[PDB]
Design a protein around this ligand. Structure first.
Ligand SMILES: [K+]
Ligand SMILES: [K+]
Ligand SMILES: [K+]
Length: 14
RNA sequence: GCUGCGGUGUGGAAGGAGUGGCUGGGUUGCGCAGC
């Protein structure tokens, strides 16, 4: 699961 | 691979989910949780 580590709104990019 | 919660702050105590984010911590860092 090496993708979006965290979610919600604009959380977790780069 | 995807998604939820201003829940976290060398401001987080007078705010949000980026209609401030090429103005910073931050190519949205950090923590927790779900598929
Ligand atoms: K801020
Ligand atoms: K912030
Ligand atoms: K933040």
């Amino acid at each position: 699961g090496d993708g979006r580590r965290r979610g919600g709104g604009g959380r977790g990019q780069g």
